Design an enzyme around this catalytic site. Structure first.
Site, mmCIF file in Angstrom:
data_model
loop_
_atom_site.group_PDB
_atom_site.id
_atom_site.type_symbol
_atom_site.label_atom_id
_atom_site.label_comp_id
_atom_site.label_asym_id
_atom_site.label_seq_id
_atom_site.Cartn_x
_atom_site.Cartn_y
_atom_site.Cartn_z
ATOM 1 N N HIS A 61 0.889 -4.460 -10.431
ATOM 2 C CA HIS A 61 0.427 -3.152 -10.861
ATOM 3 C C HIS A 61 0.048 -2.265 -9.677
ATOM 4 O O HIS A 61 0.285 -1.069 -9.735
ATOM 5 C CB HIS A 61 -0.774 -3.230 -11.780
ATOM 6 C CG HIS A 61 -0.550 -4.136 -12.957
ATOM 7 N ND1 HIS A 61 -1.210 -5.333 -13.104
ATOM 8 C CD2 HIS A 61 0.268 -4.013 -14.036
ATOM 9 C CE1 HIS A 61 -0.808 -5.916 -14.231
ATOM 10 N NE2 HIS A 61 0.081 -5.129 -14.819
ATOM 11 N N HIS A 91 -7.907 -1.108 -3.903
ATOM 12 C CA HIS A 91 -6.529 -0.932 -4.257
ATOM 13 C C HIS A 91 -6.351 0.592 -4.351
ATOM 14 O O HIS A 91 -7.303 1.358 -4.243
ATOM 15 C CB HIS A 91 -6.187 -1.635 -5.584
ATOM 16 C CG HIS A 91 -6.990 -1.112 -6.721
ATOM 17 N ND1 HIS A 91 -8.280 -1.553 -7.026
ATOM 18 C CD2 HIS A 91 -6.750 -0.054 -7.509
ATOM 19 C CE1 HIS A 91 -8.738 -0.838 -8.049
ATOM 20 N NE2 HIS A 91 -7.817 0.090 -8.360
ATOM 21 N N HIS A 93 -3.859 3.895 -6.365
ATOM 22 C CA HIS A 93 -2.860 4.329 -7.390
ATOM 23 C C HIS A 93 -2.137 5.449 -6.697
ATOM 24 O O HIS A 93 -2.764 6.178 -5.936
ATOM 25 C CB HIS A 93 -3.560 4.886 -8.585
ATOM 26 C CG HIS A 93 -4.520 3.900 -9.180
ATOM 27 N ND1 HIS A 93 -4.110 3.006 -10.145
ATOM 28 C CD2 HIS A 93 -5.784 3.523 -8.812
ATOM 29 C CE1 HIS A 93 -5.142 2.214 -10.456
ATOM 30 N NE2 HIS A 93 -6.146 2.472 -9.625
ATOM 31 N N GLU A 103 -5.804 9.299 -10.099
ATOM 32 C CA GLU A 103 -6.241 9.100 -11.468
ATOM 33 C C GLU A 103 -7.239 10.202 -11.852
ATOM 34 O O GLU A 103 -7.042 10.949 -12.841
ATOM 35 C CB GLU A 103 -6.881 7.678 -11.525
ATOM 36 C CG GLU A 103 -5.848 6.607 -11.162
ATOM 37 C CD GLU A 103 -6.089 5.336 -11.906
ATOM 38 O OE1 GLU A 103 -7.147 4.696 -11.666
ATOM 39 O OE2 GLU A 103 -5.232 4.976 -12.707
ATOM 40 N N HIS A 116 -9.583 2.996 -4.605
ATOM 41 C CA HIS A 116 -10.705 2.522 -5.350
ATOM 42 C C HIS A 116 -11.295 1.336 -4.624
ATOM 43 O O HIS A 116 -10.592 0.393 -4.383
ATOM 44 C CB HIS A 116 -10.205 2.089 -6.774
ATOM 45 C CG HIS A 116 -9.903 3.276 -7.650
ATOM 46 N ND1 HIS A 116 -9.122 3.220 -8.788
ATOM 47 C CD2 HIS A 116 -10.320 4.559 -7.546
ATOM 48 C CE1 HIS A 116 -9.082 4.423 -9.352
ATOM 49 N NE2 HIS A 116 -9.760 5.261 -8.593
ATOM 50 N N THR A 195 -9.760 1.564 -15.036
ATOM 51 C CA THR A 195 -8.694 2.480 -15.413
ATOM 52 C C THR A 195 -7.389 1.754 -15.743
ATOM 53 O O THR A 195 -6.285 2.402 -15.932
ATOM 54 C CB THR A 195 -8.367 3.469 -14.269
ATOM 55 O OG1 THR A 195 -7.855 2.741 -13.147
ATOM 56 C CG2 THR A 195 -9.600 4.377 -13.990
ATOM 57 N N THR A 196 -7.484 0.425 -15.713
ATOM 58 C CA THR A 196 -6.422 -0.412 -16.194
ATOM 59 C C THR A 196 -6.973 -1.398 -17.252
ATOM 60 O O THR A 196 -8.177 -1.693 -17.285
ATOM 61 C CB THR A 196 -5.794 -1.254 -15.095
ATOM 62 O OG1 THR A 196 -6.705 -2.301 -14.657
ATOM 63 C CG2 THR A 196 -5.290 -0.378 -13.895
#
Ligand SMILES: COc1ncnc(NCc2ccc(S(N)(=O)=O)cc2)c1[N+](=O)[O-]
Ligand SMILES: [Zn+2]
EC number: 4.2.1.1
Length: 257
Positions: A61, A91, A93, A103, A116, A195-196
């Site tokens: 992911h 990590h 995004h 995000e 994050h 958020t996942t």
């Protein structure tokens, strides 16, 4: 399983994780004009001098850099927080293009990416227990925009070709996360969620006002990762972000202005 495509993407998540439609979901749009300045908010204390990175993983992911969180080595405290949160991993995004990828948005603006730094409340003893609690996590969000390089990110960018596909990992020691921070610690904060999936509502979000700059070449290397495992068809890891979710009855506080 869940992912970021047309068929398993954010709009599908609520079917396996009904909390997707819950009352404190993340991310959100940060409306900088309606955020409430709070002179009662403490400066953030980011204590990363003794950070121990261990490994970097492509989990299908994103890629995570994991730290040894078995002592109080890299901690977040102060700001809006009561008590002490230990860094477990960071990590990002990112998008398929520079115009999207973040995000959180700020007055509807998407940044090229979002970092994050995920921290868990020391009073719950570990990450797996903290996520089951409403004050379990503190995630420090830092927007990335494309411009000058961030030299402190390069060690990360250079290892990515060793973790191209789902499930690959590499040793990743002596990475200093302080080299990912912008100059200002001015922040917005609000209560929210992972958020996942599992989208648990356990996160105190702390989003820094000031983005860091990364080079186009640095983010391009994020985009060469794969969602798929080695020997399945190639799907570039891009657009692994969840869109903004309804604020519902929450107010975003600001530490500044
Ligand atoms: C004990 O291991 C772990 N066990 C279970 N979940 C973990 N991480 C889920 C997670 C998902 C989303 C976000 S976000 N996107 O809101 O920042 C943060 C953490 C970890 N872990 O990686 O630390
Ligand atoms: Zn994240």
């Amino acid at each position: 399983h869940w992912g970021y495509g047309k068929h398993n993407g954010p709009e599908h998540w609520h079917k396996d994780f009904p909390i997707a439609k819950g009352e404190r979901q993340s991310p959100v749009d940060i409306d900088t004009h309606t955020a409430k300045y709070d002179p009662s908010l403490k400066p953030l204390s980011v204590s990363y001098d003794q950070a121990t990175s261990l490994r970097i993983l492509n989990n299908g992911h994103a890629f995570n850099v994991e730290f040894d969180d078995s002592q109080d080595k890299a901690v977040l405290k102060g700001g809006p927080l009561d008590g002490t949160y230990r860094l477990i991993q960071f990590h990002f995004h990112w998008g398929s293009l520079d115009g999207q990828g973040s995000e959180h948005t700020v007055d509807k603006k998407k940044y090229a990416a979002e970092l994050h730094l995920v921290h868990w409340n020391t009073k719950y003893g570990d990450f797996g227990k903290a996520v089951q609690q409403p004050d379990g996590l503190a995630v420090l969000g830092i927007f990335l925009k494309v411009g000058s390089a961030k030299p402190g990110l390069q060690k990360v960018v250079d290892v990515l070709d060793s973790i191209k596909t789902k499930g690959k990992s590499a040793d990743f020691t002596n990475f200093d996360p302080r080299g990912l921070l912008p100059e200002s610690l001015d922040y917005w904060t609000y209560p929210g969620s992972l958020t996942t999936p599992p989208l648990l509502e356990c996160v105190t979000w702390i989003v820094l006002k000031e983005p860091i700059s990364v080079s186009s070449e640095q983010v391009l290397k994020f985009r060469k990762l794969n969602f798929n495992g080695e020997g399945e068809p190639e799907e570039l890891m891009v657009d692994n972000w969840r869109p903004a979710q309804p604020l519902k009855n929450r107010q975003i506080k600001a530490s500044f202005k």
